[PDB]
Amino acid sequence: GPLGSPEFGYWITCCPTCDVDINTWVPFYSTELNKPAMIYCSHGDGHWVHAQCMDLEERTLIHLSEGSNKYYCNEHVQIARA
Numbered sequence: 001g002p003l004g005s006p007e008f009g010y011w012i013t014c015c016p017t018c019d020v021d022i023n024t025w026v027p028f029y030s031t032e033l034n035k036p037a038m039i040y041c042s043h044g045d046g047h048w049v050h051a052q053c054m055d056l057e058e059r060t061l062i063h064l065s066e067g068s069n070k071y072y073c074n075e076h077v078q079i080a081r082a
């Protein structure tokens with residue numbers, strides 16, 4: 001019984017150039033069924049954002065999902081010039 005997308009969910013804007021949208025999205029991860037494995041950042045304002053949206057690997061997401069791991073989004077992994 002997969003939950004459709006009637007109400008809100010992870011269909012948001014992980015970034016300013018996000019493309020994740022059920023209108024044309026699908027379960028890419030092998031551990032997922034029909035939803036983007038969003039990730040939480042730990043830099044000042046922790047937020048939620050898709051993983052593939054930042055050119056990430058499915059394995060790294062699994063490893064980072066082990067529990068204890070300083071996970072960092074893409075816009076806060078190497079802040080310096082922009």
Ligand SMILES: [Zn+2]
Nearest residue numbers: 014018050053
């Ligand atoms: Zn996104």
Ligand SMILES: [Zn+2]
Nearest residue numbers: 041043073076
């Ligand atoms: Zn972040």
